[PDB]
Amino acid sequence: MAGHTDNEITIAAPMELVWTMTNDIEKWPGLFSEYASVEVLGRDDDKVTFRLTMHPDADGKVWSWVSERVADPVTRTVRAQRVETGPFQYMNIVWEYAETAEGTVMRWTQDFAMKPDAPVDDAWMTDNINRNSRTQMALIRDRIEQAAGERRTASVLADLEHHHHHH
């Protein structure tokens, strides 16, 4: 009735592009095939509140839910909590970015608690999540890494000479 799934994956993309790309929810449909539209309801500075709209079901009914994605710059943490949720009694998706020697390690800490009409013991979800995470996170991993390879971002050359100014 509560599963802590912590799927971490290493990316060779600079923090800047990692942060800005994941904050740009409007380009999510270009990385995530799971959704159809990402609508920005409002941006409360740190809180980017969006509506995740999917493709219609077998009856032609479109599915969508509101979720709050909080950008916590201090700990390099993103907190995406779902406002609307059914089978998942609790769900807070914490994306922590860990600046490591290999690159930016992206940690998907999914704190979810299933119980309301949950046919799974949470562990069932975690197992599938671990597997699918490798699929989706690697997809995004290369996707954004290719973007960081396409656009050089900031390298050790822009500040090759420091400004010699403490003011």
Curated annotation (Swiss-Prot):
CDD domains: TcmN_ARO-CYC_like. Signal peptide: none annotated. Pfam families: Polyketide_cyc (PF03364). Involved in developmentally regulated synthesis of a compound biosynthetically related to polyketide antibiotics which is essential for spore color in Streptomyces coelicolor. To polyketide cyclases. This is Putative polyketide cyclase. It comes from Streptomyces coelicolor (strain ATCC BAA-471 / A3(2) / M145).
